[PDB]
Amino acid sequence: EHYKARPGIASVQKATESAELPMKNNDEGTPDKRGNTKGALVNEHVEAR
Amino acid sequence: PMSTRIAEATSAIVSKHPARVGLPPTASSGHGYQCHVCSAVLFSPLDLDAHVASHGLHGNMTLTSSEIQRHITEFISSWQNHPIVQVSADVENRKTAQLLHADTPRLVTWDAGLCTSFKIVPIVPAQVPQDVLAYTFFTSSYAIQSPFPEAAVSRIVVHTRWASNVDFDRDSSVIMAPPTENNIHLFKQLLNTETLSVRGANPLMFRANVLHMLLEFVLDNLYLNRHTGFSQDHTPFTEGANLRSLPGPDAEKWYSIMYPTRMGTPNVSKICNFVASCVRNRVGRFDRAQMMNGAMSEWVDVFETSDALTVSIRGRWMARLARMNINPTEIEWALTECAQGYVTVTSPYAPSVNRLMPYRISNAERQISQIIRVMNIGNNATVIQPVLQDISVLLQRISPLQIDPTIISNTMSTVSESTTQTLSPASSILGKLRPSNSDFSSFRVALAGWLYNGVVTTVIDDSSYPKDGGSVTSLENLWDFFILALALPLTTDPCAPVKAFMTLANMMVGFETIPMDNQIYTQSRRASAFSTPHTWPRCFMNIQLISPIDAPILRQWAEIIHRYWPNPSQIRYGTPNVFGSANLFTPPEVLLLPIDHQPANVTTPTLDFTNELTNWRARVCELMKNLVDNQRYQPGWTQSLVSSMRGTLGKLKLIKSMTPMYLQQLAPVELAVIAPMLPFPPFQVPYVRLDRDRVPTMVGVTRQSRDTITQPALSLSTTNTTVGVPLALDARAITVALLSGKYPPDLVTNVWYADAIYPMYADTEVFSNLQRDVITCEAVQTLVTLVAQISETQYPVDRYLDWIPSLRASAATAATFAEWVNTSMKTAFDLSDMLLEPLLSGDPRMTQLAIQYQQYNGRTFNVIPEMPGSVIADCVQLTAEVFNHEYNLFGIARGDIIIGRVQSTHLWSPLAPPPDLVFDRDTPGVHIFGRDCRISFGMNGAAPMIRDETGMMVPFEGNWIFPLALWQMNTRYFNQQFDAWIKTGELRIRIEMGAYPYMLHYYDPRQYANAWNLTSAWLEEITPTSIPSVPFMVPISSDHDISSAPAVQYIISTEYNDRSLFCTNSSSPQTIAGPDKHIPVERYNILTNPDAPPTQIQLPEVVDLYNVVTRYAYETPPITAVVMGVP
Amino acid sequence: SFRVALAGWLYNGVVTTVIDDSSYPKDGGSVTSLENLWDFFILALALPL
Ligand SMILES: [Zn+2]
């Protein structure tokens, strides 16, 4: 071995794994196969709040 | 337990209040305590409770727990708001303990053994039985003691105080093992907190480690030289010389180590050749000063084994101490001048015995420490209060003054008052003239605050004022103005005069008006709020704005203030001959006073009226009589009440107090007698009487430069910190003290002071408070001189250790290195409290000490003390300059190595390689590899390539040049590619290091040897943050003929650094095969060169290992054993 | 907050970082109050990031 990394390979890998995930898939408001918009029946502003 | 129980009870009583917050009020979230009988919202528990109480039909009140709680809260608010109670404590803090008494260093220590730091050690045993030469030849067979070890190889290593018999043990030693052992732990010590391997050290910190090593070396060799005692030589080896006898159990072994030129020379060996070359008459003692019959000689000069470096260090240390020296006659004169004749000390008059009393230091070394301890005190007010309290109790114990209100009582009791009245002037002041919490200390505390107006400002408490606006129509409220007017002139508050004008202005609002400056500092603003030069009303400097027709009383009071306020003076304490002068912004040997001083001329005092503190009371009483006179201010009063007020004022003006006489004549003498024996010297700024342009508005201290401006005079105004803190007092206490004073009826002044002042000049703590300042200045200078070696400072210093590798240091690195310096310099000199720590808060790369204050105009006065020398920094620089030439003795190699296979039968030592097989950047056909290097494999049988700096590709062969960091950053990818070619190929690399430790592996020259295992271990263990010590493979010298066997050698140095080799094949006639070196004649100059004078050292190139050293026998007695006093 | 501000430097066009409402002096404060003086100091040093 003779050498331990300065920041730390394990911690850097864990942080990169966490930051590597693809962004969420916002879906509420788009139709399904039958044509029915998928989502919960709630006010458009109450949802954002 | 009872501790917790009483603590809970005390909390349950004292914690009846929520808190003390500074914010504007608020109905909702303004801490409004709401009642319930009505919806009102009060802003205090006592306010809400007075609310609820006034609810309840006062005639029908009965006892209740609610009433009990009401009275308890009302009672405890006063005790909480008292100023002495606010600022006070019983247990000492670290900073106050540091200020009141600091751990005195131990700087006079003695040594008894022989001064030396370099020792000769055998590295390879000789062969005393052999085939060519019978054993009867050698002197070891006869058990003869030789000054130098018999061995095939003898090195010379470093071990500080290996032959020393010390008095006190400095705990900083530089101990080294011989070269054939690992020494990497000496250089992996300071900043290698990330290195894994126990046998590795980071190359980018060799410079810092070596600087710390040299500092510890110098700190260890700081002793004096004892005079032990000699003995005639009863044998014919010397010409009857006198020989030392150093103390110890096994002392008979030292007569052959101290004196190399005393053995016999029966043989033609190397040691005998040297001893026969030496001269004969330089042994033992040759000089002494015997100033007495039957007493030890004062000093001697002796020839003996010792190194010129440690001899020089101890000589310079003794020179510094000799500068610090003083004598009992000068101590007598100093103490007599300090006591001012009230104490007679005596010194003997006869041939002395050469004491050594190092207690005298310069003025810069004292002003620097004053600046430091003022920097350690800014803005705290719990660090400076205990000093004032101690001076207060000392003043009370030394003063012949008493206090008793019975004088005021008896004076008041003579005025006639009507029994059928509603106002009693004599009975009102008697009530409001009893101090709260019955403490009369505020008088002595204010009197002691005169010595400190640059860091402490004694103001009068806000509670002493008339409670939210006065009124001239109120008797109990008029006595408050009287008390404040009498009490203000004794405070240090620069804005004292504007109060006692705004107090009367507040009190008569609606009777007289005067033009203010703002809508905010109106005439109805509290008088205690005007504490700055900025807030003085314009009608106080331009009095014609006050008109004699509108505001006659204000006009008259303003004229009285401008024309009769007391005048400052001075007393001239101290004696700066022995003691330095510590004051910064005043001349040396002078003490300022906020009142005039005038020496008495009779030592049996009787009362008199002629002084400024009585004239002030007369003026105040006259104007009080005036503002009582007219019916314009007090219309509802009777002739009886007016005449009673007049009588009380006219008699209070003629009260017979000794306090003003005292403050004029005797108090400044007591201050001057107390000042020189004070653990924190006075720190004053000028007393401006009434001018708005000279009132000081700040006092700042700097400890570092700002951007690039290296001169302190240009950064002192923008890189300083303000110091100072107000301290509240009690006007009632001060005024009762001024009104009631008294002397004992048997007062004879000289007899009183002659035995009141004696017991404080019998202790000698003041003399020991100076060596602390010496060490403080030494530490500051040493830090400044060491940090410049690794950083870029603004100080001119020489740089010897530039060839050693070092990292690009930042503020954190500098702070760490300074911490190590501080710790080592405390461990040496044996003091446990703070030292050099106030400077470590910033960064120690641009340090500088300076101080200044500023007036109201903007005119700033600064004091920049001249940094005196420092023997410790000088000796560290000398040791570095000697390291530059004798680096091999500390196990350091200089240059760079050349990895490459060399198989032969020759016996050249790898530390002195033949110049034919060393190359450099100036060699034809050398490939220099820098930063942008890539390797490209070879395909289909073609050889792999590597990229030159110039963009070329070269096969794995030839003569190359690496920076060490290149390999160190690609250690594993390079091993795999290159190690197969270095071993049995044609590759030769010159790693560039600059400085590196090393080990040594010897081998029998007539057998096969191969250094590939050691070399491969080293290369394999190189790492981006560490390298193991460089292993060499050296042959063993041979006394006689031998046979040659092949040897394979891989690592070699570049320049000759086989300098720690002392002698090879000692005890034999000559060396036939291998590294040859006789005894170094240039080392022993005084013996081998008859023309050289005795005291002659060629220091920066050789340490000489033998010379003349002077041993002392001085006496270090306490001062009380030499300077006796006459009780 | 420090490192989230550093990260938000990269996404100016989607998310804007503003210092919290409750970090300001209560009721606007006053220059006659030490607490609001220190509040203003902290706020002034925090705003530029
Ligand atoms: Zn109410």
Q: What is the 3-state secondary structure of B986-1025? A: CEEEEEECEEEEEEEEEECCCCCEECHHHHHHHHHHCECC
Residue B55 vs residues B47, B51, B59, B1115: alpha-carbon distances, Å: 12, 6, 11, 84
- Show the tokens assigned to B1105: 């290992």
Q: How many Å apart are CA B465 and CA B740, to the nearest integer? A: 22
Of the candidates B767, B783, B782, B863, the one whose C-alpha atom is nearest the C-alpha of residue B374 is B863
Minimum CA–CA partner of B1025 in chain A: A3
Expt. technique: cryo-EM
Residue B727 vs residues B87, B463, B484, B678: alpha-carbon distances, Å: 8, 13, 17, 21
Of the candidates B472, B480, B475, the one whose C-alpha atom is nearest the C-alpha of residue B500 is B480
CB B33 within 8 A of CB B48: yes
Q: Are strands B284-288 and B299-304 parallel, antiparallel or unpaired?
A: antiparallel
Q: How many Å apart are CA B681 and CA B581, to the nearest integer? A: 9
* φ, ψ dihedrals at B64, nearest 5°: -165, 150
Q: Do B1024 and A1 touch (CB under 8 A)?
A: no
Please state the residue numbers annotated as binding site of B: 35, 37-38, 51, 55
In DSSP notation, B48-78 reads HHHHHHHHS-GGG----HHHHHHHHHHHHHH
Handedness of CA B982, B984, B985, B988 (dihedral sign): positive
Give the gap in angstroms from C-alpha C16 to the nearest C-alpha of chain B.
32
Name the strands in the sheet holding B1047-1049, side by side, starting at the edge strand that comes first in the sequence: B902-904, B1047-1049, B1009-1010
Strand spans (E) along B283-442: 284-288, 299-304, 345-346
Q: Exposed (0-12), middle (13-18) or buried (19+): which is B351, by Cβ within 10 Å?
A: exposed
CB B882 within 8 A of CB B801: no
CB B151 within 8 A of CB B124: yes
CB B761 within 8 A of CB B339: yes
- Show the tokens assigned to B296: 């030890």
The amino acid at B878: L
Minimum CA–CA partner of C36 in chain B: B23
Helix (H, G, I), strand (E, B) or coil at B754: helix
Please report all neighbours of A, defined by 3+ CB atom pairs within 8 A. Answer: B
Q: Do B26 and C27 touch (CB under 8 A)?
A: yes
Of the candidates B92, B168, B107, the one whose C-alpha atom is nearest the C-alpha of residue B772 is B107
- Residue for token pair 């204050």: B853
- Show the tokens assigned to B72: 């308890």
Please state the residue numbers annotated as binding site of B for Zn(2+): 35, 37-38, 51, 55
Which helix (H) or strand (E) covers residue A45, if one does? helix A44-48
Name the strands in the sheet holding B927-928, side by side, starting at the edge strand that comes first in the sequence: B927-928, B958-963, B987-992
Q: How many Å apart are CA B458 and CA B724, to the nearest integer? A: 11
CB B43 within 8 A of CB B30: yes
Other CB atoms within 10 A of residue B614 CB: 19
Q: Do C33 and B26 touch (CB under 8 A)?
A: no
- Show the tokens assigned to B955: 């096969």
Strand spans (E) along B537-633: 569-570, 592-593
Q: Do A3 and B196 touch (CB under 8 A)?
A: yes
What separation, in Å, do the N-terminal and C-terminal C-alpha atoms of chain B show? 51
CB B533 within 8 A of CB B541: no
Other CB atoms within 10 A of residue B318 CB: 18
Q: Exposed (0-12), middle (13-18) or buried (19+): which is C4, by Cβ within 10 Å?
A: exposed
CA dihedral B602, B608, B613, B618 (to 10 degrees): -170
Q: How many Å apart are CA B999 and CA B1027, to the nearest integer? A: 13
Whether chain B has a CB inside 8 Å of the CB on A1: the answer is yes
CB B737 within 8 A of CB B399: no
Other CB atoms within 10 A of residue B378 CB: 18
Whether chain C has a CB inside 8 Å of the CB on B942: the answer is no
As a three-state string, the secondary structure of B162-188 is CCCCECCCCCCCCECCCCCCCCHHHHC
CB B946 within 8 A of CB B929: yes
Largest CA distance in chain C: 40
Helix (H, G, I), strand (E, B) or coil at B958: strand
Strand spans (E) along B532-629: 569-570, 592-593
Whether chain B has a CB inside 8 Å of the CB on A6: the answer is yes
Q: What is the CA radius of gyration of chain B?
A: 42
Which helix (H) or strand (E) covers residue B699, if one does? strand B698-702
Helix (H, G, I), strand (E, B) or coil at B1124: strand
Q: How many Å apart are CA B442 and CA B728, to the nearest integer? A: 9
CB B157 within 8 A of CB B118: yes
How far is ligand 1, taken at its centre, from the CA of residue B37, in Å? 4
CB B427 within 8 A of CB B755: no
CB B349 within 8 A of CB B758: no
* φ, ψ dihedrals at B172, nearest 5°: -135, 105
Q: Exposed (0-12), middle (13-18) or buried (19+): which is B770, by Cβ within 10 Å?
A: buried
Largest CA distance in chain B: 136
Q: How many Å apart are CA B878 and CA B1099, to the nearest integer? A: 9
Give the gap in angstroms from C-alpha C11 to the nearest C-alpha of chain B.
33
CB B871 within 8 A of CB B320: yes
- Residue for token pair 């000492």: B92
* φ, ψ dihedrals at B402, nearest 5°: -120, 165
For residue B883, the Cα-to-chain-centroid distance in whole angstroms is: 29
Look up residue B226 and give its DSSP letter: B
Q: How many Å apart are CA B187 and CA B621, to the nearest integer? A: 80
Q: How many Å apart are CA B1121 and CA B1114, to the nearest integer? A: 15
Q: Exposed (0-12), middle (13-18) or buried (19+): which is A16, by Cβ within 10 Å?
A: exposed
Helix (H, G, I), strand (E, B) or coil at B714: helix
CB B504 within 8 A of CB B560: no
For residue B1076, the Cα-to-chain-centroid distance in whole angstroms is: 53
Look up residue B688 and give its DSSP letter: -
Q: How many Å apart are CA B384 and CA B378, to the nearest integer? A: 9
Of the candidates B430, B429, B439, B431, the one whose C-alpha atom is nearest the C-alpha of residue B461 is B439
The angle at the Cα of B739, spanning B737 to B742, to the nearest 5 degrees, equals: 75
Whether chain B has a CB inside 8 Å of the CB on C33: the answer is yes
- Show the tokens assigned to A43: 């006010």
Q: Do A2 and B194 touch (CB under 8 A)?
A: no
Residues across chain B = 1127
Look up residue B497 and give its DSSP letter: T
The angle at the Cα of A10, spanning A6 to A14, to the nearest 5 degrees, equals: 125
Whether chain A has a CB inside 8 Å of the CB on B1023: the answer is yes
Q: How many Å apart are CA B480 and CA B982, to the nearest integer? A: 99
Q: Are strands B958-963 and B927-928 parallel, antiparallel or unpaired?
A: parallel
Q: How many Å apart are CA B1023 and CA B197, to the nearest integer? A: 10
Q: Which residues of B431-470 are buried (b: 16+ CB within 10 A; e: fewer)?
A: eebebbeebbbbbbbbbbbbbbbbbbbbbbbebbbbeeeb
CB B395 within 8 A of CB B451: no
CB B534 within 8 A of CB B557: no
CB B648 within 8 A of CB B426: yes
Residues of B in contact with C30 (CB under 8 A): 24
Q: Are strands B110-111 and B224-225 parallel, antiparallel or unpaired?
A: parallel
Q: How many Å apart are CA B323 and CA B615, to the nearest integer? A: 53
How far is ligand 1, taken at its centre, from the CA of residue B563, in Å? 53
Q: How many Å apart are CA B981 and CA B979, to the nearest integer? A: 5
Residues 6+ apart with CB under 8 A from B401: B658, B659, B662, B666, B741, B742, B743
- Show the tokens assigned to B909: 């030592």
Q: Are strands B994-1003 and B1009-1010 parallel, antiparallel or unpaired?
A: unpaired
For residue B867, the Cα-to-chain-centroid distance in whole angstroms is: 14
Half-sphere exposure of B1054 (CA within 13 A, CB side): 19
Helix (H, G, I), strand (E, B) or coil at B665: helix
Residue B127 vs residues B142, B150, B152, B1068: alpha-carbon distances, Å: 15, 10, 8, 10
Q: How many Å apart are CA B1123 and CA B329, to the nearest integer? A: 8
Q: Do A2 and B1025 touch (CB under 8 A)?
A: no
Look up residue B90 and give its DSSP letter: S
Other CB atoms within 10 A of residue B175 CB: 12
Other CB atoms within 10 A of residue B1045 CB: 13
Counts of helices then strands in chain A (DSSP H, E): 2, 2
Q: How many Å apart are CA B211 and CA B787, to the nearest integer? A: 10
Q: What is the CA radius of gyration of chain A?
A: 21
Which helix (H) or strand (E) covers residue B220, if one does? helix B206-220
CB B13 within 8 A of CB B76: yes
Residue C8 vs residues A19, C17, C46: alpha-carbon distances, Å: 14, 7, 15
Strand spans (E) along B495-646: 569-570, 592-593
Q: Do B22 and C30 touch (CB under 8 A)?
A: no
Q: What are the beta bridge partners of residue B1111?
A: B300
In angstroms, what is the resolution? 3.0
Q: Do B22 and C33 touch (CB under 8 A)?
A: yes
For residue B497, the Cα-to-chain-centroid distance in whole angstroms is: 39
CA dihedral C41, C42, C44, C49 (to 10 degrees): 160
Relative orientation angle of helices B639-652 and B425-432, to the nearest 10 degrees: 50
* φ, ψ dihedrals at B1109, nearest 5°: -125, 145
Of the candidates B472, B307, B372, the one whose C-alpha atom is nearest the C-alpha of residue B850 is B372
CA dihedral B613, B619, B621, B623 (to 10 degrees): -150
Alpha-helix residue ranges (DSSP H) falling in B716-834 = 731-739, 749-756, 765-787, 811-827
Relative orientation angle of helices B612-629 and B552-564, to the nearest 10 degrees: 180
Other CB atoms within 10 A of residue B358 CB: 19
Other CB atoms within 10 A of residue B1075 CB: 19
In DSSP notation, B870-910 reads -HHHHHHHHHHHHHHHHGGGGTEEEE---B--EEES----T
CB B926 within 8 A of CB B920: yes
Q: What are the beta bridge partners of residue B300?
A: B288, B1111
Residue B911 vs residues B661, B917, B1033, B1038, B1065: alpha-carbon distances, Å: 87, 13, 9, 18, 18
As a three-state string, the secondary structure of B95-140 is HHHHHHCCCCCCCCCEECCCCCCEEEEEEECCCCCCCCCCCCCCCH
The amino acid at B367: Q
Which helix (H) or strand (E) covers residue B275, if one does? helix B270-277
Largest CA distance in chain A: 63
* φ, ψ dihedrals at B242, nearest 5°: -95, 130
Residues 6+ apart with CB under 8 A from B738: B443, B486, B487, B490, B613, B657, B659, B660
Q: How many Å apart are CA B164 and CA B410, to the nearest integer? A: 78
Which helix (H) or strand (E) covers residue B409, if one does? helix B406-412
Half-sphere exposure of B515 (CA within 13 A, CB side): 9
Residues of C in contact with B22 (CB under 8 A): 33-35
CA dihedral B824, B827, B832, B838 (to 10 degrees): -20
